[PDB]
Amino acid sequence: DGVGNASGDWHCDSTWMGDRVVTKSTRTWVLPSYNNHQYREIKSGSVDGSNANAYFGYSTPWGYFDFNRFHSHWSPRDWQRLINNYWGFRPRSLRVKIFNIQVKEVTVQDSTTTIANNLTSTVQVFTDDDYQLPYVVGNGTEGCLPAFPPQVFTLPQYGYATLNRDNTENPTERSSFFCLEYFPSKMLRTGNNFEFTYNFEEVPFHSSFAPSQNLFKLANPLVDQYLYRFVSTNNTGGVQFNKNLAGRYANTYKNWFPGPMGRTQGWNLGSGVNRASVSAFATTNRMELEGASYQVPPQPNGMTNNLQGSNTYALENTMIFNSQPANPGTTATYLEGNMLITSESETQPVNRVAYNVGGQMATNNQSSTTAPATGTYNLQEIVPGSVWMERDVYLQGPIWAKIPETGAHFHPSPAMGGFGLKHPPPMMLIKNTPVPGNITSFSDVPVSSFITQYSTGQVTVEMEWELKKENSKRWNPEIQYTNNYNDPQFVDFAPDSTGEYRTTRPIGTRYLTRPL
Amino acid sequence: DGVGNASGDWHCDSTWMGDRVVTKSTRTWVLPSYNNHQYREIKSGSVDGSNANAYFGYSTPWGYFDFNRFHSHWSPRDWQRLINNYWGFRPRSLRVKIFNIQVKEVTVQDSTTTIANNLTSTVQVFTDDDYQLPYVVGNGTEGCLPAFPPQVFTLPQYGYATLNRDNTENPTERSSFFCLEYFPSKMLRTGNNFEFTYNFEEVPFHSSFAPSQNLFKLANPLVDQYLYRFVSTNNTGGVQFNKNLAGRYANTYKNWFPGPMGRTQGWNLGSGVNRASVSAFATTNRMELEGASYQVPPQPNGMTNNLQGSNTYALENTMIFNSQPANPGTTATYLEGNMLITSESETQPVNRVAYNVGGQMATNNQSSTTAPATGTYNLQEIVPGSVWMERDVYLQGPIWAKIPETGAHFHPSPAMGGFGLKHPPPMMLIKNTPVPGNITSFSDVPVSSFITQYSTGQVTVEMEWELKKENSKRWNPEIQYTNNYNDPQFVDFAPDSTGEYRTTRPIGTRYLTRPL
Amino acid sequence: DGVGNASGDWHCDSTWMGDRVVTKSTRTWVLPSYNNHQYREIKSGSVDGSNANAYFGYSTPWGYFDFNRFHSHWSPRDWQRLINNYWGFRPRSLRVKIFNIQVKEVTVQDSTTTIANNLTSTVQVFTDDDYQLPYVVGNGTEGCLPAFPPQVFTLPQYGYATLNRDNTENPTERSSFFCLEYFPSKMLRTGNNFEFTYNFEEVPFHSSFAPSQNLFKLANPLVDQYLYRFVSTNNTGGVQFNKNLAGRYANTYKNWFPGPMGRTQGWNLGSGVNRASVSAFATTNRMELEGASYQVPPQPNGMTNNLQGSNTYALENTMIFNSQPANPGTTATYLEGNMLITSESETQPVNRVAYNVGGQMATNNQSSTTAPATGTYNLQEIVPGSVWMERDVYLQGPIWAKIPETGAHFHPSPAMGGFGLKHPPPMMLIKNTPVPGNITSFSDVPVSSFITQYSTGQVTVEMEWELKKENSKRWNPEIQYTNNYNDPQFVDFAPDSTGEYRTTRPIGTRYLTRPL
């Protein structure tokens, strides 16, 4: 519309209406003119002693809007209301608006650097609706809408890795270059705005409850089974049997089995002792791909990284967040007191402990001359009649991930937790349209000098979430997430004396309980 | 209709119409009177040092029409048009016609053997629509419609193995005998024809594209993750963490995992060195069934048998064709220069290398007195969040396979590649109706002398295929299958000076690329 | 409309719809105020030892939009899709939009030079619909829309040569001066835009296929002709004849002849030896006009500048591009490794080799006392029953050329390749409207001082192309353009580490084959 007329209003709120909740989040963003308006082939050979760090790709002059983290939409109090009252939830729709665009021109005349807004300049915006570009959004990276509403953020630069040759920095003939200008996009001057709507595909509810029963003890403890078990052989070798008694869950016949597991080194936190001076990398779990070895945190779903009351943690099977955002590219050493370390203990009644053996199988054929032998295993995958709980989601964790397009997959549930989608919210890309400097003579060579500038504006994201009601008959009170602190010096989830947002703990989702 | 009137015309063609393509193939066939009009119990004990070669079954006087190979329908040029332009395809319908039947009577009078056509003789034809007979068609056997249209072929004899006892040649009380005359069938004299139509069940498109991205490096290489990792313990044992940086794909948290794998010995081709004088059989991968050991080429889907640029091949995880048809029952030794050896390298960005370890797990519990230990594994099956590409299909490979009827299975994708069907094109059986010789006296004993004869005619198969369009935004050119030869002495996919059809290479399907 | 409202969006895309394809290209342009708002008579005498370099003309303060190069509309991948699947194509319509205009005023106050946009300034635009101005667009000059979308370009200055006297720098009484202000034009301020539509006249499809047969061997090689030939005279002089046999293509009677030819010196590239220290100019092909000698590359259509597999090139009958844009007016020496040298070998089955003799004629009257004599010719023009292929078009080559208006011409097919048009896309001219500086006193003398400024904006061009489908019955696979590189260090047709667009090869159009 015009220079002196706002193109949108500030919407931040949450509205609960029975079985649905609508969250609205608005934030102020800033967008730098990355790579000075050009694409740059980027790459890397081995780094830190691993050719898995090798890659070939491109960086683009584009930035993107990422809102794939629960805290970008949920305030702590709203998150508490959710996890303390519902058995599950799931996203249904999404609406995004970008408005109140302002383009500023920066000039360093004799070192006084003045910032003046350029009224006739534009930004370009488009969404990759058909997923024709590498989808970098569901990979746990930085640059999402901030958790605290007043915080202004910088949009991350869009870049991607394509195929690299023989674990080197070189491309292959199958490496692909994607040109973002080769998509239609809207051009906005200061009076214009941009809007976009989307609907999520049908996905299962996240399970925000914890088993109030152990998978191996579903049988009635007051009744014996009508099934018997082999317990030994007489002095001759004639097999003998005993009836499985009531309560003897060690022997009861079972219908269902725990989820798959892959042993993951257990470490001790707080008041726990560990092997000193160890360098983690060499003994970490790995998976080989294209002739290289990669660490695969947090490991496939199916296990619990820690037992309730225990201080042992299968750290590679854990989601570990920082209690605050850190500078980019830092190599500083962090200790437990600076980290938000999550625990999947709610799942222990059905998910196997990650730092223990999964079980044992028979390793030979017994005979009059050979005693039966057994052997433990450190990994077991999916078997029929298997059941397990997916990783929990957290206020500071990711919401969804794109299921890779290959034509085949099994149980597309994202390892980092959340919702696996075939058609996730599309990439929303934006960039500052280049404005050429004083060019006075012709040349068939592409212009190189550009007036330096950056853009800023607001962004609103509104999401509707469907809720699954709690229909429990438990008589005694349940566990609830509570604001429990002792002799506080500050309020958690609030700005400090300097205005920095403080969050001392990760908030999961499983407080309510349900029997199996 | 009549003796002097043709009962069908020659249809060989292909018609492309947007999202569909219709292929038509006609061929001349010849049918011998197998087993001289009788069923013969067939069997075998151990052979070549393996009781897995033992079997019990029957051979029948029937022949069958098999057209379960891509080249029976696709000409090389049409195959090239397909693989260079589409992201996938799948069969939709099938129509078969058998016509222009001619029955010839052979007589060896004093060794002059004259061939005269018997106008009053018939052939019988029927299709096993309800799958009540052993389905032998999707098992990589010979006798399919020839790839080159002018070639006349012999119909293979129908036979099957039922249950054999304790890996011997003896039957069991559960062994079943199937009598093909116990089905209704059409009888055709020289003026008659036979027609049949069929529709394929809904099946997924074959993926005829290659990942242009590595499964473990989907993250944006310009942005760090907001997740941290355990990297070591201080001189006391207090765990320490580091932020996962941009591009360090060796450490990035991952959402998805590669497909399942089972280590398969890697061998070298061409300019590669191998252990000399080895006898393959003993160290080949195996699976036990009913007290016996079987080789299971080409292994379950999920792996790549070779890396791009590498000359190493997990030969037991490879589809190996001959560059021409060989005589039946040959035991000649073949070298690489006579074989069409396929490579699944297009899948390397998501399928694990078959001749390498899959990865490593933790093998103990670390402690102040014990350093953490890890151990590699040679096989890992399906885990949640797993993704992979099925084996590719080839111009000379099979199209479909029947899913065994057992009431339980997982991801029915045929190991040899193609489409797994519950109700595949039915067996189309045909045989020469017996004509008794000069019988002059009665006997309650079944007649044994029969006028010797064989039949010949044409067969047409028409298939409609649905195509999935390529919707790519890749800027730079893609790889395409091309007729690239240097200083040729002959044209590949053409008859030679003697008329024999020459095919020097296997043509896969994955040339186009798509990001993940 | 207004200052803070965009007047157009970014459209870059391609849409294939059966027999048509629509390409859209948008680019950012910059326009200098050429000649400081005035016309300048320009001229030149002899230069480099040639009075053909003499000319008389004018330079104007106008710039023009040129999009007469295939790569301005086709991306490499789209070009590959075109040439690998169609037998021909042709342009049908064109739509152009100029928008998001920004006019900047430059001021050098004490050497700090500030750039500020002048909101009340205009640019003027008009198209020469009636072709009343010299048409400079179809002459292989620089300044066309860039091949790579993100590249910003400078608009070339409009100028033309009229008639010069006796190969000197002087005008003639017939020399004409054209004043561009003497045309109606639109004036646009920052909120305005300009649009224009055009339809191409009916033109033949470009032939994007290659003959799979030799023009002189169309006869059936298994059958003799019923025509005979004179082969000699007996010892007396009585003529003798022989029947033309099957396959003897050297003697067969022919119905059709190759295209016209004019011998062009052949040079060797790569591993080929050439006469050293030669200065090309003196022995180059020429044509005389108005008392002067001109080089006429790439020579009239009808010949092939090179044979398949041969390293010899009739360089003056070749289109030679640079693998990147070079500065204006450069006199640097370029070697083969920096050039994109094209080859017309696809046409060799019908176009005569340019560096060979065309053939030979009889040069005398034989007699009992004089043996028959023959003589080779170095040039032969059009004869009845002549057939040939026009020059191929290239991704980096021109699309069309204006047919000179003289009232007479033959086969208006542009030597540089492309489409010869009588009414081609009109010249689209634009310039910065002059803004006078501080003038304080009257004078009948035309104002000379002007506020210095330049303009910038976007330009979109959309073209619809009609396609001719490939209807081939060739059995074996065809040749296809493919992204085939060995051990690449960079991706061709992609920006390098510095962002510069790299194109290492010229892509022609003739990959598919058709018989004659």
Residue numbers in the entry:
A (entry chain A), B (entry chain A), C (entry chain A): 209 to 724
Text taken from the publication that reported this structure:
Adeno-Associated Virus (AAV) is a small (~25 nm diameter) non-enveloped single-stranded DNA virus in the Parvoviridae family (genus Dependoparvovirus). The icosahedral proteinaceous shell is composed of three capsid proteins. These proteins (named VP1, VP2 and VP3) share an open reading frame and differ only in their N-terminal residues. We use a high resolution (2.5 Å) cryo-EM structure to analyze details of the molecular interactions that are presumed to be key to efficient infection and are likely to be relevant to serotype-specific tissue tropism.
Gold standard Fourier shell correlation (FSC) curves indicated that a 2.5 Å structure was obtained for the receptor bound dataset and a 2.1 Å structure was obtained for the native virus. These are the highest resolutions achieved for AAV5 structures to date. When comparing both of the reconstructions, there was almost no change in the viral structure upon binding AAVR. Following least-squares superposition, agreement of the new complex structure with the prior structure is reasonable, and excellent compared with the uncomplexed AAV5 structure at 2.1 Å resolution. With high resolution structures of both complex and native virus, interactions can be analyzed at the atomic level.
